[PDB]
Amino acid sequence: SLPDLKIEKLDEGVYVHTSFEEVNGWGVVPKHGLVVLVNAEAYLIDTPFTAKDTEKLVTWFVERGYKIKGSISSHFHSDSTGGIEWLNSRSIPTYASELTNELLKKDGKVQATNSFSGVNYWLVKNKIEVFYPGPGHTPDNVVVWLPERKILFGGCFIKPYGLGNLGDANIEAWPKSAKLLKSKYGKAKLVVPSHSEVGDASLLKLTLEQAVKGLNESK
């Protein structure tokens, strides 16, 4: 029924994986994550929704010679974490913030095997950075920065045309978090949202506008 998992080169050593779900009320929702190649190793930036799509994604790269060295989930929702259970089962290291794992635990979900905390975290020193801007889409949302190509993966926090599911959002904090993200990452060449097309740094401004507007609307 749905379109198939898509894998497409974004930049040198950077691929976008897109998986799909049909959500009641929203229609067909694409979900973007990244695969980042460092030498002969691959790192997943968010998992697809399902174990099946995660297995497809991993084997696409294995079959091309890359070893999967780990995955990082940008927040606790299943469009970022759905694949952790399968990855653990393959002894592929999974990473999430401490806050994300606590939210998984509390949601009754399997957690990543490695956790980190703090505002900045190197998944791979000088190549794959994780940054916590503050709460917005969810309390735990982090973003991932790739310094060489200046690519920002913004996950479900980057929401340039509407905020999406607010079930777990903190709309009071989201404009401060987004303003912080915009100042820190305005030099990004590419910004990759979870659910909308890749754009440039202006997606950070659009997200701040959507956050402010959403705060104002709620009064």
Ligand SMILES: Nc1nc(C(=O)O)c(CCc2ccccc2)s1
């Ligand atoms: N897996 C899903 N995540 C979200 C989310 O908000 O992150 C969904 C809501 C659909 C939507 C996505 C983007 C903009 C507007 C609406 S569905």
Ligand SMILES: [Zn+2]
């Ligand atoms: Zn989410």
Ligand SMILES: [Zn+2]
């Ligand atoms: Zn989402």
